[PDB]
Design a protein around this ligand. Sequence first.
Ligand SMILES: [Zn+2]
Lengths: 50, 196, 98, 1112, 98
Amino acid sequence: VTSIRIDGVLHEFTTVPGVKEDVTEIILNLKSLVVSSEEDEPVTMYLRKQ
Amino acid sequence: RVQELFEARVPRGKAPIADVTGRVRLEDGERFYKITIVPDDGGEEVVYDKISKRQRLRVFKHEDGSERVLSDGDHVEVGQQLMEGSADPHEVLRVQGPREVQIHLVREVQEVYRAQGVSIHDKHIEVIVRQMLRRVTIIDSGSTEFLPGSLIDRAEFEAENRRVVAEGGEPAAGRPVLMGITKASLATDSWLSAAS
Amino acid sequence: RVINRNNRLKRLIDLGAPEIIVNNEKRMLQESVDALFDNGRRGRPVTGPGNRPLKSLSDLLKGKQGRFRQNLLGKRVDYSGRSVIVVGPQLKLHQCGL
Amino acid sequence: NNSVPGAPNRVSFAKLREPLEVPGLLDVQTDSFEWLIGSPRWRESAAERGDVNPVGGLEEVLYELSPIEDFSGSMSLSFSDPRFDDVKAPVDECKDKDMTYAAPLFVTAEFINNNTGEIKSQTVFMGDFPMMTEKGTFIINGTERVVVSQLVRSPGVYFDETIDKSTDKTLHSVKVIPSRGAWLEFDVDKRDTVGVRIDRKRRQPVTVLLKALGWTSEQIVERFGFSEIMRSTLEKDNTVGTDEALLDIYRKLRPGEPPTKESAQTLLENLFFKEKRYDLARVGRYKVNKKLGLHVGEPITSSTLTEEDVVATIEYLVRLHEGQTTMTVPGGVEVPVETDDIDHFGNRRLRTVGELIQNQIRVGMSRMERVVRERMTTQDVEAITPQTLINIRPVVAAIKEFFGTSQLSQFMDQNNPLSGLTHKRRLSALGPGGLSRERAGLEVRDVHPSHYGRMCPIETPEGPNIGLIGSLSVYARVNPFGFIETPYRKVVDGVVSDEIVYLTADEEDRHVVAQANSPIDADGRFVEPRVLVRRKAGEVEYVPSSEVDYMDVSPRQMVSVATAMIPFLEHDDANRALMGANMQRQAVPLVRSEAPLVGTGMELRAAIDAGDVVVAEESGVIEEVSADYITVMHDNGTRRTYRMRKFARSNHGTCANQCPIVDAGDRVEAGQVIADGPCTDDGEMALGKNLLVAIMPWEGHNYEDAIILSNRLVEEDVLTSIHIEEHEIDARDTKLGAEEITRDIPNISDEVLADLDERGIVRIGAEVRDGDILVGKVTPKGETELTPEERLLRAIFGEKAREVRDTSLKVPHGESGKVIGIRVFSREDEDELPAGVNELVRVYVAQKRKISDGDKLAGRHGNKGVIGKILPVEDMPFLADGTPVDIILNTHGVPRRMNIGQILETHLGWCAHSGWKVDAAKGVPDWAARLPDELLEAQPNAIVSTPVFDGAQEAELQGLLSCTLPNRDGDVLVDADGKAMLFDGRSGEPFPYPVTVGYMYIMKLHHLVDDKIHARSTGPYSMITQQPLGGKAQFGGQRFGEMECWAMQAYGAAYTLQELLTIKSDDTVGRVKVYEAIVKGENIPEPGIPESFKVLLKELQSLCLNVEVLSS
Amino acid sequence: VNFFDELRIGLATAEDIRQWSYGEVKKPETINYRTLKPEKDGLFCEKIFGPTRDWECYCGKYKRVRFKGIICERCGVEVTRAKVRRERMGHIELAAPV
Ligand SMILES: [Zn+2]
């Protein structure tokens, strides 16, 4: 992962209602994510959970 | 110790000095030591009334040993300290001249520095002591304008003395003398630095 | 103070008056000039605030802030820079890292 | 034995049990204020302590004042019973809204007129009071404040003794130091002239003043018959007669005044019996009574000196001169006779915040009552009302200025909770009302045998203020008078007593104190017949096991709070221990904290009492939790909510956050931590991380305290911190007009202001680079103006027809990061602002810093260092199983500094991390006899704790290192000694010899590199001195000391010095020309005349001194 | 330029001070407290020392940059950089020797 985009959030030093940990903690957790790329261009994923 | 030595104030130890060479005739006063030395050639005895709380130092003998006690009736060389301590530079200067006091100061500073173990060359101290003792106090002005008892450097004093003598005017009687760093630096030739 | 007193002298001498007032006024002028060239040299120094002696003209030269001393304490120069130092064993003797 | 409900479980190398839990670490700070204001809890505590008279602070101070009256006796005023009210607004809003946490106080004043006989009583408002929050801090104008205690010498009598160098005879000097009044010095001299020095006067014989009171000569003879020297003095004095004596005393005190009997008679009582003019604190009176054993059976009420005290003092002095050991006075029990010591804690009292605030309000009350009495005397006597009398300005102004400018009001450093706690517990010794640095003697900075148990001897600032700033002991508690105490259990007949009592310095000296570490049988029987003991002063000697009276409580009774959490403190050196303790107060809160693997058991307790961690009040069940707030349901049906501040700038620039560590649907018991603040992990302090260390010199990159770090730390955010800056701009009115923040700004490209919003401020969440504009504003131009006409003219016509300059605020030199939030205060919205201001706006910039080169690191044993180089993860040495190390330490610095404790800490950390299992099938090994039965079986990443002065011994470590659990690969890495075989990352071949490895706790200091680095080539120049500005923020050049001039002269370098002094500091045309020449290819022109010389000329020419140049 | 063979301090004289200065202060008034400008011949009047701004006449008659060495007759001031204000002096006249 290179860069994220959180809807309704303007930067990383803040929180979002409904979650138990702020943006920094989720960024740290996402750092552990492992993915393999087959295409040589920036691709985009989605993560929608309510 | 170094500050006091360079400042050339009254030594705290203030050891007795051998003003003249002669046959020491010392009578040990348990309260105040009384020291007299019979001159060899002739003259009177210089008398010292020193404090007896100390322990007499070595007498100058053929052996020249530190363990020896100050034996009465012996003989000592001019300028030698009779007891442990420090000799006032003015006394040794007046009774020996500038060379002896210069070498004594150099040796004393070198010794105190080597006590701590550090080592430095002598010339760095010679360059300082040369400036420190470069003044000639004058007792009388006579045929000179300057006020008697005013410090004058040796070069200018000699120049004025020779100039006045060459024209027949009587010479001015002056003697060398040293001072501390503060007094040696407060009197200079450039006015701007002095104001600084 | 000095200018004000001089103008009072001028006006008074113009108006005309006996010797006592003129002499007193001249004395006051001399006092002010002495104070300006130096405060506290002689007599009670002038004090306006908190009974604090004022810094006269001559005070610009003597003292720690005297202009003579301050020229020797150094100046702030350009083309400078400070940072921490870390030992580097990969450098020759006549070399340094920036 | 975990007192708190849900603290993490960490078995400890416990061998001895402490019979009492550590008292509230902040009770000392809060008790003073509680006593001062007066609350039911304080009254109950005082009644429990046994004090007969429960008296508050405000009531005492404003009751000792009343009843005021006029000299004519026809009018009087009284007012008592001070009471307080509720709060204005919560603490959060007060801190955020810039208000001040306070509360109003009302005093019921009664207005009585003597000649008439009327009473006018009603409540009166007396301003606000800066109440103290539950964390022992003062919130003033939104900025945290904390007042530090002070050390003062208790007012009393001190018997000094100086030996004459010539006479070689004892000269006993007694000097009395009351709170306010005259000083009496009775000294026996070689001449035997036993005299007095009242207000630094000549030594007048004591007998003269003794007779001045009318003391019969026969009573002098009989009461001093035992004294011989004083009898000789009596026979030697010439002047005799009550009238003659008093007149002579008056002349000595006040010469040149009408000598009359009435004058001296009134002056005596005025200077020694008028309470207002001559007063002593109740502590002083009690201490003097105890010293002389006089007036012991009654509670002190009158606080004035008495004649019997003086006669007893002189009797004591003469008896001491005679050489007696103990002296007795009728009505007084036997007491010893000896000289007093200044550096004894039986004399140096402690004035908490209560005393300081009481004195300040006393001064305010005196100022108010002076004007009140003058007004009542002068104002009409018929329709006068107390409301019109009392003036509230002086007291409020006094308290405000005390909180503002008093040196005892310091910003509470908030790098981490430990620093705040230490600051709250600090014991200052300097400041107003105390000795200065130069006058204070050097001896006071040394330890005293009476410091054991009261003030820690280790913790101390490194700077010149060494010995003047201590810290309370763990178990120290201030007595109601101000003398520090220390718990003790009294041995009655050689059997330890579980019940404990508190003893002060004087009582401690008068008894026998045992040693806590001395073995004691489970039944309370002393196994050893001979037990070491501490005696009167600096004396220790074995004594039979029966006469011993007192025993300490715990081995940790003399260490400070900061020093109490340094493992293996019994192995380091004093200087190293002090250095480590001071370093522990400089950590920086990280992003992901981890609790230490090895640390004392005083970590969680020091965190709960720190106040930076919330805790449930009542045992309830959590319904739901959120990242921003929590809601716990009480068992009584009352819902409560706690709000947790997230990413709020700390008082020192660091960040502070709170992350709840509770789950939804758990019945949380009362007293259980609910959220972890900065430097915390599961409700316990964590100031650093755990790194795998190696001890070996590596290619000189760790030379002379340097340090090497693996890139794994950098790329994993192991030591990444967050720092939040703060900037603010304001638009204040001016005579030429009022400035207004506006998006538009003259002559600026659209791109530059592309970030500002419509209102004229940068949008939140926009990256900012150094030199960028942060907020725009316009400054009007100056022209001719008229106050009465221009206002109306501007109102009717000529609106917005004047020039405006640009003075927008921009980011300083060397700052960057995101914009997290913007706070704007407007006078339109009825927001309190400083006078003469309309719009003050502050912007917070938060930057995430990753540990880099030039950063400080240091363990808990005081071993500083810098990051010499950060090698790639592929280059660091790695264990035989492929585990690369994270940091390498030099070895030559360990034995010279003599801090061997860190080696043991590393070994124990490795042992705990790897987990151990001591063999027990054949039985407990002899070396494992004293190990706790539950400490023989550990798990990977286990937690262990070694209390100071009582921890695992060398044999324990030797045994543990031989039973570590094997790696998952089946092999054990380290040997019994603790060393291991490595593999070089560069050469690829193993080192010829093994090396030591293990986990050691590493903190992060606040001396970062980004703050230090700075450059300056060309920039703004000062206008008054024509020199470049100074400081990194102002983008100014560096200073050039005179020693540099001396060095340049030494080398004989001339042109370089010329440039440094002329062409780069002062000469304007020189700077312009040289800059242009460098821009082009032309040679640098020779410098000119420095501005300093020309200024000196044009200034010296002002003193009529024609200073020519003589160019010829 | 930078050649200073010697430096001698001489005792000045009334005519010397007359020569040095470019004006004769007459009123003690400082900068105006309302318009923040010097008062006529006050302790800061531009007619004595120099223009408050650079290349700026008091009356604005010759405010353009291209005027050096030109004294404005309307206001009787000179046009040079603000620095010249730093290197010109004033002498007060005394009605009574001191
Ligand atoms: Zn003009």
